[PDB]
């Protein structure tokens, strides 16, 4: 049995324990990020498993620094712990070097930490993928995505979870380089509604956050009224 | 073979369930709580006439106001008993007051699931304790009897048997117990029940009995005091 | 001064194909003599001796611990240690205590176990080695000892002349030091024999 | 450092490593202890004979302190570790209480050492039982037994090791006030008890006595075969 | 990781320690090694395995080790393991000498090492050392002594014994020929050769194929010496001459 | 944290199979040869060097430990590098204490001791290498072999790696006690020719020598010269 | 099977069986219910009694003046977690001189309980909690699981037959926000009563109640102190 | 023997009965999981690294997709194999080099850096609790005495310096192409080093590249600082090759 430890290659050179962790992410509902002219917008299909839960419970969008948002899919406790790692890294960076961590460098650091959990019998890989988004006048808009193996790349648009491919094909239809965050939120809401399987899982909440010129480089929840306008646009577009 | 901290599909730790089974290999012990005090009684289980019966101790003093009866793997009980003793003395040292029966039982029970092979110091506990305990005493809540098993679960009982014949003994306890029962009745009741459940004929050397009363410190019955109680039974 | 607490003196001296090493015999605590046969020169081999002056407790500890190291060396290597290698062993041992030293300053005298060439050296309390071709001295009367050695020593002395010189150097040096003396012992080391003598000496 | 849990529970509440340690004890040479009126006696079997052996170097009877000694059965290398740990402890007790240990104190200590090695990571249990004998400050004679689990009890007489079942049966029928009324008879009771199991009697019974205040005497083969004959000829009658 | 741990320090169901037993099988295949006590001394005689023609012969022996001034040993089993143990024996003996300023009594050295071996069977999850040792020595408490220890951490004193290949056979021959209280170093030497001759039954006994060391007392000092090959040949000669008498 | 149990253990017949298997890695390695002459020692080895694309001078199999001691191996190269580094470090630790270069035999003992650790210590496999170690001290040449068990032996001449058994019998019918070093170098290269396959250039063998002057690798141009006869 | 003994072993479907198994410890505990209004947070719990002569296990524990918990699962793990929560609360009052916000404490439980789910030879916590709290953001009911996930709830039930309690709670949750304290506890008790076999009823021996709100520190009601609340379930 | 197995010799780095380390073998297979090939060639004046650049997804920021890394100002690297493993090895190399400079006062030689990474990889082949990294590192730099340098180290902890080398799926084919070419050349030495690298890669893959489908990095005796070619720069080479 070649698939019980992250410290064992299979005879074909695979690490099944990392692949299995990836399957946990691909069972999760869908998260998307889109980079545009003046920032980055995140959206999450947030399945409601009980009507007894408060609206806002089990957030999948996190502030990891004042200028950096994180959007997650997969095992949520693993994702939160990673948000804590990312936070700590951003904090330590500021204490040591005296300025806000560059997004790319934060993505690389956290990805190496994820990577460290893919080498050993002593620990298991994280069952999560996540996106990091930021904006500043100096660096522009940046959107990175990290998976359970610890690979980290930059994107114009990205999706993770179980309708990943369907989401991407819709994202590809946007000329996001020429769009603002205010336009893109509506398109994010639209795509979540398109890929949502309303027969198989009934109820969901749309979760929206952004970072861009319009928020002054701060990662913030999309305001309630803009979210509701976006949902209404998405739902009516589905017709 | 699997690790000592493995859950079964029913949500129990195999090691703890197995430690609970080891309790069934112990001699029967009985605790009864009355408004006049608590009694503890235990089958010694003499295996040879050459063995000294007084060297079997399955009832011990924790402090003046608290005794403890044990069943299961008796060697495992020693560190639990010592922990209880040290804790009550620490409480006395720090607070200048006696520790409640409940609090002692609680402190001991926090040792319960502290086993495992890669969180802890170079050779910590490899397994749970194969022991059940009855703590009987008197504190300001009045007389009190508490039971504890290898899960760390502990609870107050009005009357309770543990060990091999405890189903059996517990039935007979439901039958005879009443809230207004006297201590002398409880003493007689528990020796009648031990007499039923023991393989050997009950006498004044193959059992022990102790009491704690609001009046009076932990008291182990002498051969002579046991014989007087055995006459009726 | 920590090194004058017990007092004492050692020296070694080179001759043709022989060496000599000598020591006073007093063990005292400040003014008080306690014993007059206290050992300060210790064999480290058939033809290799170490003499230690300084604090009596450290004389004994360094001698014992050096012996520990030497026995293991010899069992493990093929062979009897060379004089120069003993010096290095001692240096290393003393320097390990660089920031809390043993208060002893040894001299070594011997013949190479294969070549029989004469060797002498001394070391300070932290293990600085000093080899010479003439003599070395260590103890509470070093200045006295240097005066006698500089004035009397000559190259290529035979065993009898070496014996007389080291003896006169010792006796007259310690007789100007209150806390050294109560006897003098001398070992003459040759290829074929060791000669050990105690000297007629002042006992005040 | 090695932290594997070695002694663990099995279904039904068994500790298999402890049971297996107990099997090691059952294969050891037979050891016997009898508490007399003012004497205590330990006797032990064999183990190998062998003419070329230096007899001195393999004894299974051991002083712990002036007033306490022990015999063991089982893994001899394990026994040595226990014995030395107990010897150290007797000196700590003396250090901090300025009395010798009671026999019960040192038994209690050995037992709890053994129990710890059934509940600590990285270690197997000790494969020995011990018969521990001596006298308390007030002259009371004592015989205790420990086993690999850490359980311990006091005994009037007992046996451990191979054929302990049958030797214990014999002691049960033969341990009376009469059989221990005197020192010679107490010693004879140990020998008779061994002579029941000891292959080529005997020959290979080692034997030692402790008297009140008087410290461990080992009997020598000349002194033993005196008792052997003195009992073998009494059983003809 | 529990899957890969072979559990070298646990009991089997009969109260056995398999790694110790298995190590004892390793030893049984190693070079034969015997020890004989006499009135005027003690000896070790060992089969050499380093016998290939192209070997270079650089130390004073192959399997005889000096431990301190008054003691030596020989070994049968894994050689590298024996090097660790003999190094530890030397350390212990010097620790004792440091502390007490007198040599370690023989049995005390043996016991100290056997406690290390015992530990390796009880905790640590490591393979035991694949070595049995014969120890010869003199001390002021029991004079000339011979000890044997094995991977269980067990030891004993012996007047004559053998470890390694064909031990059981060697010990039978010793049982039969050894005179308790009446042996000299000269007669023990004769017996040693007699024993090796029978137990190296593959094949015809040569000085190049054995090593003998003796331990004696001269002028209050212990002398430990490995016999030169001339002396070993002479002893082999004398044993063959002796069998010439054997019938008439 | 690391595995604390031994990965080498005794089998039911008394064998340490991991060490046997390490020996099989050695037997499958490229051939190495060592000859002790009267006035020196030669070590020679084959480069398992495919491709002309290799820079043959970029890594060496014949390596100096000290001015007076050198090494070669058969088996796994990366394991060898571990032991080269440790040997060098051990030699320096000795020199700092004793102020005398480490005797070849003392160095071999300490290196072999390290190899023994890897047969017993937690969570590691033995080294898949055997070393040949040469040196000069006490006015005299030394050739030693150290195997994966931590066993070591002094040789007059030997071979290791592929075809070593034949290599050994080839040396047996060819070595004499009174042989000079320049002659010994020739017989070392002939011994590699026995089991070569490929045609020998000075770029695909390596040769090291050890005499009173110290240890050094022969240069390509020097190896070229010895190869012209062979 | 090969995938179910270690919390570090992912299965081929992207599950961790050890965590699922730890969750069964909570499903087999006795039921407890948590709910809230605009002003109060309530916990109600059923106590399982071992025999007829046993008192009945404590289900409700004090954490701080503003926080209490109800437990389901391994009692020893419940106490270990309770002690952690107590300590975090004391630390916050020591350092800042104000109550630890309930959501922040719950975050700390998540982070703490996630750790052993990812290291070899460790195990999940076999306990689930309902957490009643009051702070600047009003009343709270949180739920924690052996998976280290947690949930912010309008109301919740865990333990054996809690699905009935959950259903009742969905049925009436639109009422809860505007309920007075007595109405709210009554609702809690009715939900809990849904978990019981048709025969059996809520009694002063088996019901335990915990309450916190705007005007009221976390208080536990047992035995005779529950009778006011049980009478006029009319 | 011939593919025999005992115990856990396919799961952890213990010896098989032939003396093999299967887990190390399998780490080499992991290098090919990525489906990419890299080539490196050295001449008298420069050393070059060329690799494939695959951007299958339109939605990637292709500026973030690279396998070329700067280790110091003067040492460049191409990585082949598992991406996250590769990144980790890059960080380690960067750390080893920075540390070298701090302790010793001069830049780490390329050979020493390659050796150090190889030695670190060796530990993963002898210790049982972690796996090897399923990646391969090729390093380039200028050495003052020896000229341009190309070094490679692998998951076994082997390393070597080269005239030219390759890694990944078409490693063997690249090795043959390059071998055939050096024999032809005088003093067995490449001269047209960027052209040879790109041609080798294009031959073994049968692609004929656009300037967005490869990456090129260089160090030169005149300009020892590691330089990554731009698209246009690469295009000028692709066009000069197209026309002969
Ligand atoms: Cl995904
Ligand atoms: Cl029970
Ligand atoms: Cl020291
Ligand atoms: Cl202990
Ligand atoms: Cl027994
Ligand atoms: Cl010595
Ligand atoms: Cl000694
Ligand atoms: Cl381990
Ligand atoms: Cl190196
Ligand atoms: Cl050097
Ligand atoms: Cl060189
Ligand atoms: Cl519960
Ligand atoms: Cl529980
Ligand atoms: Cl969950
Ligand atoms: Cl539930
Ligand atoms: Cl720097
Ligand atoms: Cl070219
Ligand atoms: K490995
Ligand atoms: Mg004077
Ligand atoms: Mg005077």
Integer Cα distance of H115 and H137 in angstroms:
11
Domain at G122, CATH number: 3.60.20.10
- Determine F/D contact with 3+ CB pairs under 8 A as the test: yes
Query: Chains touching chain A at 3 or more Cβ pairs under 8 angstroms?
Result: E, G, H
Name the 3-class secondary structure at H202: helix
Q: CB of D2 within 8 Å of any CB in chain F? A: yes
Pick from E82, E153, E81: which is nearest to E118 by CA? E153
**HSE of B17, CA atoms in CB hemisphere, 13 A:** 13
**Chain H residues inside the 8 Å CB shell of E1:** 128-129
H or E segment and range at residue B181? none
CB contact under 8 A, G18 and B3: no
Best mutation site among B7, B136, B141, B177 for testing chain G: the one with the most G CBs within 10 Å? B7
Q: How far is CA C152 from CA C144, C163, C164, C184, D122, in A?
A: 12, 12, 10, 18, 70
CB contact under 8 A, H82 and A14: no
**Cβ-Cβ contacts under 8 Å for F66 (sequence gap 6 or more):** F88, F91, F95, F101, F102, F107, F135, F215
Exposure string for H216-233, b = 16+ CB within 10 A, e = fewer? bbbbbeeebebebbeeee
Q: Nearest CA to CA, how far is A177 from chain G (Å)?
A: 36
Integer Cα distance of H27 and G111 in angstroms:
34
Integer Cα distance of D88 and D66 in angstroms:
13
Q: How far is CA D113 from CA D119, E17, E187, in A?
A: 10, 21, 49
Name the 3-class secondary structure at D72: strand
Q: Chain G, 110-139: which have a CB under 8 Å from a chain B CB?
A: 116, 119-124, 126
Tokens 């324990």 belong to: A17
Q: Is G136 exposed, middle or buried (0-12, 13-18, 19+ CB in 10 A)?
A: exposed
CB atoms within 10 A of CB H130: 18
Q: CB of B124 within 8 Å of any CB in chain E? A: no
Integer Cα distance of D164 and A131 in angstroms:
73
Pick from A57, A55, A81, A86: which is nearest to A69 by CA? A86
Integer Cα distance of C20 and G146 in angstroms:
82
Domain at F66, CATH number: 3.60.20.10
Give the resolution in Å: 2.1
Pick from C45, C26, C24: which is nearest to C34 by CA? C26
Maximum distance among all alpha carbons in chain G? Answer: 54
Show the beta-strand stretches assigned E in chain H.
37-42, 46-52, 68-72, 75-81, 135-143, 147-153, 159-161, 164-168, 214-220, 227-228
Domains recognised in chain E with CATH numbers: 1-248 (3.60.20.10)
With beta carbons less than 8 A apart as the criterion, state whether B33 and B158 touch: yes
Strand order in the sheet with C194-198: C135-139, C9-14, C18-24, C184-190, C194-198
Residues paired with E74 in a beta bridge = E64, E134
With beta carbons less than 8 A apart as the criterion, state whether A121 and A7 touch: yes
Q: Strand E71-77 and strand E131-139: pairing? A: antiparallel
Dihedral of CA atoms H3, H6, H8, H10 in degrees, nearest 10, equals 0
Q: Provide the residue range defining the domain that includes D14.
A: 1-237
Minimal Cβ distance to H129: which of F18, F55, F123: F123
H or E segment and range at residue G66? none
Integer Cα distance of G207 and G48 in angstroms:
10
Task: List the alpha helices (DSSP H) in A153-223.
Answer: 164-171, 181-195
CB atoms within 10 A of CB E91: 15
Q: Strand D152-154 and strand D141-146: pairing? A: antiparallel
Integer Cα distance of H155 and H133 in angstroms:
6
Task: List the alpha helices (DSSP H) in C50-141.
Answer: 56-76, 83-96
DSSP tag of C26? -
DSSP tag of F22? H
Determine the Cα angle at E133 with ends E132 and E134, to 5°: 135
With beta carbons less than 8 A apart as the criterion, state whether E33 and E167 touch: no
String of DSSP letters for A19-49: HHHHHHHHTSPPEEEEEETTEEEEEEEEE-S
Integer Cα distance of E228 and E231 in angstroms:
6
With beta carbons less than 8 A apart as the criterion, state whether E77 and E132 touch: yes
Residues paired with G142 in a beta bridge = G131, G152
With beta carbons less than 8 A apart as the criterion, state whether G32 and G130 touch: yes
Domains recognised in chain C with CATH numbers: 1-204 (3.60.20.10)
Domains recognised in chain B with CATH numbers: 1-233 (3.60.20.10)
Exposure string for A147-179, b = 16+ CB within 10 A, e = fewer? bbbbbbbbbbbbbbbbbbebbbebbeebebeeb
CB contact under 8 A, F7 and E53: no
Looking at the 3D structure of chain D, how many domains does it have?
1
Q: Nearest CA to CA, how far is C78 from chain E (Å)?
A: 8
DSSP tag of D208? E
CB contact under 8 A, C72 and E101: no
Name the 3-class secondary structure at G92: helix
Tokens 């099977």 belong to: G1
Integer Cα distance of F155 and F133 in angstroms:
10
CB atoms within 10 A of CB H181: 18
Integer Cα distance of E190 and E177 in angstroms:
10
Q: Is B96 exposed, middle or buried (0-12, 13-18, 19+ CB in 10 A)?
A: exposed
Integer Cα distance of E119 and D76 in angstroms:
13
String of DSSP letters for E56-110: ---SS-SSEEEEETTEEEEEEE-HHHHHHHHHHHHHHHHHHHHHHSSPPPHHHHH
In chain H, where the domains are located:
1-244
DSSP tag of E208? G
Integer Cα distance of F181 and F37 in angstroms:
5
Minimal Cβ distance to C85: which of F100, F106, F109: F100
Identify the experimental approach: X-ray
With beta carbons less than 8 A apart as the criterion, state whether G95 and G154 touch: no
* Cα D228 to middle of ligand 16, angstroms: 88
CB atoms within 10 A of CB H33: 16
Integer Cα distance of D113 and D170 in angstroms:
31
**Cβ-Cβ contacts under 8 Å for D48 (sequence gap 6 or more):** none
Residue B100 is encoded by which pair of tokens?
């409640």
Q: CB of D199 within 8 Å of any CB in chain B? A: no
Q: CB of D118 within 8 Å of any CB in chain E? A: no
Domain at D193, CATH number: 3.60.20.10
**Chain H residues inside the 8 Å CB shell of A12:** 26, 29
Residues paired with D42 in a beta bridge = D33, D208
With beta carbons less than 8 A apart as the criterion, state whether G218 and G40 touch: no
φ, ψ of residue E206 in degrees (nearest 5) = -130, 155
With beta carbons less than 8 A apart as the criterion, state whether F206 and F58 touch: no
CB contact under 8 A, A4 and E3: yes
With beta carbons less than 8 A apart as the criterion, state whether G194 and G187 touch: no
Dihedral of CA atoms H220, H224, H225, H228 in degrees, nearest 10, equals 10
Integer Cα distance of E78 and G65 in angstroms:
69
CB atoms within 10 A of CB B93: 8
Residue B88 is encoded by which pair of tokens?
């009550």
CB atoms within 10 A of CB A138: 6
With beta carbons less than 8 A apart as the criterion, state whether E125 and C103 touch: no
Residue G56 is encoded by which pair of tokens?
């009945």
Strand order in the sheet with D141-146: D61-65, D68-74, D128-135, D141-146, D152-154
Q: CB of D27 within 8 Å of any CB in chain E? A: yes
Q: Is the peptide bond before A18 cis (omega within 30 degrees of 0)?
A: no
Q: Which residue of B has its CA nearest to D175?
A: B50
Q: Is A208 exposed, middle or buried (0-12, 13-18, 19+ CB in 10 A)?
A: buried
With beta carbons less than 8 A apart as the criterion, state whether E134 and E99 touch: no
Pick from E77, E142, E63: which is nearest to E110 by CA? E142
Strand order in the sheet with F69-75: F63-64, F69-75, F129-137, F140-146, F152-154
Tokens 């000496």 belong to: C201
Tokens 């199999």 belong to: F61
Distance of CA H180 to the CA centre of its chain: 20
Residues paired with B131 in a beta bridge = B72
In chain A, count H helices and then E strands: 6, 10
Q: Is G167 exposed, middle or buried (0-12, 13-18, 19+ CB in 10 A)?
A: middle
With beta carbons less than 8 A apart as the criterion, state whether B162 and B23 touch: yes
Q: Nearest CA to CA, how far is D206 from chain E (Å)?
A: 17
**Cβ-Cβ contacts under 8 Å for G231 (sequence gap 6 or more):** none
Residue B114 is encoded by which pair of tokens?
């502290």
Closest-lying ligand to the alpha carbon of B163?
2
Q: Is the peptide bond before D97 cis (omega within 30 degrees of 0)?
A: no
Q: Nearest CA to CA, how far is B203 from chain G (Å)?
A: 28
Q: What is the architecture of the domain spanning H1-244?
A: 4-Layer Sandwich (3.60)
Strand order in the sheet with E160-163: E160-163, E33-37, E42-47, E210-218, E221-226
Exposure string for E175-205, b = 16+ CB within 10 A, e = fewer? eeebeeeebebebbbbbbbbbbbebbeeeeb
Pick from G81, E187, H96: which is nearest to B152 by CA? G81
* Cα F209 to middle of ligand 20, angstroms: 67
Domain at A48, CATH number: 3.60.20.10
Pick from E152, E23, H8, H121: which is nearest to F120 by CA? E23
**Cβ-Cβ contacts under 8 Å for D221 (sequence gap 6 or more):** none
Residues paired with H128 in a beta bridge = none
Looking at the 3D structure of chain G, how many domains does it have?
1
């Amino acid at each position: 049995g070649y698939d019980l430890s992250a410290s064992t290659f299979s005879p074909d050179g695979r690490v099944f324990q990392v692949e299995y962790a990836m399957k946990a992410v691909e069972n999760s509902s869908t998260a998307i990020g889109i980079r545009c002219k003046d920032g980055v917008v995140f959206g999450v299909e947030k399945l409601v498993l009980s009507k007894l839960y408060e609206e806002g419970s089990n957030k999948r969008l996190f502030n990891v620094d004042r200028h950096v948002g994180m959007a997650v899919a997969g095992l949520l406790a693993d994702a939160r712990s990673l948000a804590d790692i990312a936070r700590e890294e951003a904090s330590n960076f500021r204490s040591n070097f005296g300025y806000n961590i560059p997004l790319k460098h934060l993505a690389d650091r956290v990805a190496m930490y994820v990577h460290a959990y893919t080498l050993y019998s002593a620990v298991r890989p994280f069952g999560c993928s996540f996106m990091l988004g930021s904006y500043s006048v100096n660096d522009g808009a940046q959107l990175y995505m990290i998976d359970p193996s610890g690979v980290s790349y930059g994107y114009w648009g990205c999706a993770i979870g179980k309708a990943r491919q369907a989401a991407k094909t819709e994202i590809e239809k946007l000329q996001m380089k020429e769009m603002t965050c205010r336009d893109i939120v509506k398109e994010v809401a639209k795509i979540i509604y398109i890929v949502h399987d309303e027969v198989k899982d009934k109820a969901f909440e749309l979760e929206l956050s952004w970072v861009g010129e319009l928020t002054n480089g701060r990662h913030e929840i999309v305001p309630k009224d803009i979210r509701e306008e976006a949902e209404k646009y998405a739902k009516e577009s589905l017709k | 073979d699997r690790g000592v901290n493995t859950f079964s599909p029913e949500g129990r730790l195999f090691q703890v369930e197995y430690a609970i089974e080891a309790i069934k290999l112990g001699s029967t012990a009985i605790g009864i709580q009355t408004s006049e005090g608590v009694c503890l009684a235990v089958e010694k289980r003499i295996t040879s006439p050459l063995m000294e019966p007084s060297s079997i101790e399955k009832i011990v003093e924790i402090d003046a106001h608290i005794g403890c009866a044990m069943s299961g793997l008796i060697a495992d009980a020693k560190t639990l008993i010592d922990k209880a003793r040290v804790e009550t003395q620490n409480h006395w040292f720090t607070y200048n007051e006696t520790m409640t029966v409940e609090s002692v039982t609680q402190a001991v029970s926090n040792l319960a699931l502290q086993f495992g092979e890669e969180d802890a110091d170079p050779g910590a506990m490899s397994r749970p304790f194969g022991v059940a305990l009855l703590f009987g005493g008197v504190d300001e809540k009045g007389p009190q009897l508490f039971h504890m098993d290898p899960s760390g679960t502990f609870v107050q009982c009005d009357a309770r048997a543990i060990g091999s014949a405890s189903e059996g003994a517990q039935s007979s306890l439901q039958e005879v117990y009443h809230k207004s029962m006297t201590l002398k009745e409880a003493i007689k009741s528990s020796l009648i029940i031990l007499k039923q459940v023991m393989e050997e004929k009950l006498n004044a050397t193959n059992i022990e009995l102790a009491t704690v009363q609001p009046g009076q410190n932990f008291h182990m019955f002498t051969k002579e005091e046991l014989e007087e109680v055995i006459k009726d039974i | 001064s920590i090194m004058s607490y017990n007092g004492g003196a050692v020296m070694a001296m080179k001759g043709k194909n022989c060496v000599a090493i000598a020591a006073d015999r007093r063990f005292g605590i400040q003014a008080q003599m306690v014993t007059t046969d206290f050992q300060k020169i210790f064999p480290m081999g058939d033809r290799l001796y170490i003499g230690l002056a300084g604090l009596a407790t450290d004389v004994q500890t360094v001698a014992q611990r050096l012996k520990f190291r030497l026995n293991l060396y010899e069992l493990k290597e093929g062979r009897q240690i060379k004089p120069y290698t003993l010096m290095s062993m001692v240096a290393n041992l003393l320097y390990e205590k660089r920031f809390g030293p043993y208060y002893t300053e040894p001299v070594i005298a011997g013949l190479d176990p294969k070549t029989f060439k004469p060797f002498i050296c001394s070391l300070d309390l932290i293990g600085c080695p000093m080899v010479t071709d003439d003599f070395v001295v260590s103890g509470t009367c070093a200045e006295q000892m240097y005066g006698m050695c500089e004035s009397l020593w000559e190259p290529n002395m035979d065993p009898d002349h070496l014996f007389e010189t080291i003896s006169q150097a010792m006796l007259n040096a310690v007789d100007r030091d209150a806390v050294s003396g109560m006897g003098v012992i001398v070992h003459i080391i040759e290829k074929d024999k060791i000669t050990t003598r105690t000297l007629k000496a002042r006992m005040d | 450092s090695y932290d594997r849990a070695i002694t663990v529970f099995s279904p039904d509440g068994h500790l298999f490593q402890v049971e297996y340690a107990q099997e090691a004890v059952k294969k050891g040479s037979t050891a016997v202890g009898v508490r007399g009126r003012d004497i205590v006696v330990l006797g032990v079997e064999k183990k190998s004979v062998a003419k070329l052996q230096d007899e001195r170097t393999v004894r299974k009877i051991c002083a712990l302190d002036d007033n306490v000694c022990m015999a063991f059965a089982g893994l001899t290398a394990d026994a040595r570790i226990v014995i030395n740990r107990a010897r150290v402890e007797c000196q700590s007790h003396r250090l901090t209480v300025e009395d010798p240990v009671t026999v019960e104190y040192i038994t209690r200590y050995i037992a709890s050492l053994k129990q710890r090695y059934t509940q600590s990571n990285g270690r197997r249990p000790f494969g020995i039982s011990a018969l521990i004998v001596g006298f308390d400050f007030d002259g009371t004679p004592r015989l205790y037994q420990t086993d690999p689990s850490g359980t311990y009890h006091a005994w009037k007489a007992n046996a451990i090791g191979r054929g302990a079942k049958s030797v214990r049966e014999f002691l049960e029928k033969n341990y009376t006030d009469e059989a221990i009324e005197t020192d010679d008879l107490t010693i004879k009771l140990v020998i008779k008890a061994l002579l029941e199991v000891v292959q080529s009697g005997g020959k290979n019974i080692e034997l030692a006595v402790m008297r009140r205040d008087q410290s461990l005497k080992i009997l020598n083969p000349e002194e033993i075969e005196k008792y052997v004959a003195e009992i073998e000829k009494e059983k003809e009658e | 990781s529990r899957r890969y741990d072979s559990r070298t320090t646990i009991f089997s169901p009969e109260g056995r320690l398999y790694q110790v037993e298995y190590a004892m099988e390793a030893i049984g295949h190693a070079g034969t090694c015997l020890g004989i006590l006499a009135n005027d001394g003690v000896l070790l005689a060992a089969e050499r395995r380093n016998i290939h023609k192209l070997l270079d012969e650089v130390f004073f022996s192959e399997k005889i080790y000096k431990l301190n001034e008054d003691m030596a040993c020989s070994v049968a089993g894994i050689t590298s393991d024996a090097n660790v143990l003999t190094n530890e024996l030397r350390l212990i003996a010097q620790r004792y000498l440091l502390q007490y300023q007198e040599p370690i009594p023989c049995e005390q050295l043996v016991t100290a090492l056997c406690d290390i071996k015992q530990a390796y069977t009880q905790f640590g999850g490591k393979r035991p050392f694949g070595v049995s040792l014969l120890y010869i020595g003199w001390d002021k408490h029991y004079g000339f002594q011979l000890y044997q220890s094995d991977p269980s951490g067990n030891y004993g004193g012996w007047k004559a014994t053998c470890i390694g290949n064909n031990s059981a056979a060697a010990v039978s021959m010793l049982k039969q020929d050894y005179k308790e209280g009446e042996m000299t170093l000269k007669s023990a030497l004769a017996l040693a050769i007699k024993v090796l001759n029978k137990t190296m039954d593959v094949s015809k006994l040569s000085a190049e194929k054995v090593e003998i060391a003796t331990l004696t007392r001269e002028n209050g000092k212990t002398v430990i010496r490995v016999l030169k090959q001339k002396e070993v040949e002479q002893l082999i000669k004398k044993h063959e001459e002796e069998e010439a008498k054997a019938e008439r | 944290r690391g595995y604390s149990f031994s990965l080498t253990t005794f089998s039911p017949s008394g064998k340490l199979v991991q060490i046997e298997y390490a020996l099989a890695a050695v037997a499958g390695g490229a051939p190495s040869v060592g000859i002790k002459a009267a006035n020196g020692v030669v070590l020679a080895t084959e480069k398992k060097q495919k491709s002309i694309l290799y820079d043959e001078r970029s890594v060496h199999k014949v390596e100096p430990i000290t001015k007076h001691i050198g090494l070669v191996y058969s088996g796994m190269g990366p394991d060898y590098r571990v032991l080269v580094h440790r040997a060098r470090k051990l030699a320096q630790q000795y020199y700092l204490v004793y102020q005398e270069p480490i005797p070849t035999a003392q160095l071999v003992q300490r290196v072999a001791s390290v190899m023994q650790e890897y047969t017993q210590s937690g969570g590691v496999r033995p080294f898949g290498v055997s070393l040949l170690i040469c040196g000069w001290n006490e006015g005299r040449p030394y050739l030693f072999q150290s195997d994966p068990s931590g066993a070591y032996f002094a040789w007059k001449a030997t071979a290791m790696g592929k075809n070593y058994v034949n290599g050994k019998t080839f040396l047996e019918k060819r070595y004499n006690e009174d042989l000079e070093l320049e002659d010994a170098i020739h017989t070392a290269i002939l011994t590699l020719k026995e089991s070569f396959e490929g045609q020998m250039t000075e770029d695909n063998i390596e040769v090291g020598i050890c005499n009173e002057a110290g240890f050094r690798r022969l240069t390509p141009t020097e190896v070229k010269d010895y190869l012209a006869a062979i | 099977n090969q995938y179910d003994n270690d919390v570090t072993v992912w299965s081929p479907q992207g599950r961790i069986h050890q965590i699922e198994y730890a969750m069964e410890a909570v499903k087999q505990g006795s039921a407890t219910v948590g709910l809230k209004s605009k002003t109060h947070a309530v916990l109600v719990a059923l106590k399982r009694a071992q025999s007829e002569l046993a008192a009945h296990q404590k289900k409700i524990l004090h954490v701080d003046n503003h926080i209490g918990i109800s437990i389901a699962g391994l009692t020893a793990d419940a106490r270990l977690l309770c002690n952690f929560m107590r300590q975090e609360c004391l630390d916050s009052r020591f350092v800042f001189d104000r109550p630890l916000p309930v959501s922040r404490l719950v975050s700390l439980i998540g982070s703490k309980t996630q750790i052993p789910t990812q290291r070899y030879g460790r195990r999940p916590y076999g306990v689930g909690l309902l957490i009643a709290g009051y702070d600047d953001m009003g009343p709270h009911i949180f739920q924690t699981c052996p998976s280290a996930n947690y949930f912010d709830c309008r109301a919740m039930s865990i333990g054996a037959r809690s699905q009935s309690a959950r259903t009742y709670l969905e049925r009436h949750m639109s009422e809860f926000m505007e309920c007075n304290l007595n109405e709210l506890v009554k609702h809690g008790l009715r939900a809990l009563r849904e978990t019981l076999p048709a025969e059996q009823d809520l009694t002063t021996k088996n019901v335990s109640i915990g309450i916190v709100g705007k005007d009221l520190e976390f208080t536990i009601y047992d035995d005779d102190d529950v009778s006011p609340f049980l009478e006029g379930l009319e | 023997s011939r593919g025999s197995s005992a115990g856990f010799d396919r799961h952890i780095t213990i010896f098989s009965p032939e003396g093999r380390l299967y887990q190390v073998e399998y780490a080499f297979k992991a290098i090919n999981q990525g489906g990419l090939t890299s080539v490196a060639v050295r001449g008298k004046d420069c050393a070059v690294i060329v690799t494939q650049k695959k951007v299958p997804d339109k939605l990637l920021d292709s500026s973030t997709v690279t396998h070329l890394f700067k280790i110091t100002e003067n040492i460049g690297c191409v990585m082949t194999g598992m991406t996250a493993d590769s990144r980790s090895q890059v960080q380690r190399a960067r750390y080893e080099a920075a540390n070298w400079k701090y302790k010793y006062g001069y830049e780490i030689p390329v050979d020493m850096l390659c050796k150090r990474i190889a030695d670190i990889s060796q530990v993963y082949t002898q210790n049982a609790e972690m796996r090897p990294l399923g990646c391969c590192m090729i390093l380039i730099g200028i050495d003052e005495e020896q000229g341009p340098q190309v070094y490679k180290c692998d998951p076994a902890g082997y390393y070597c310096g080269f005239k030219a080398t390759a890694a990944g799926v078409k490693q063997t084919e690249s090795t043959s192409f390059l071998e055939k070419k050096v024999k032809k050349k005088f003093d067995w030495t490449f001269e047209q080093t960027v052209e040879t690298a790109i041609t080798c890669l294009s031959t073994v893959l049968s692609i004929d590249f656009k300037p967005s489908e490869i990456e090129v990095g260089v160090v030169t005796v005149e300009n020892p600082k590691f330089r990554i070619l731009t698209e246009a720069e690469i295009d000028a080479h692709l066009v000069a090759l197209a026309e002969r």
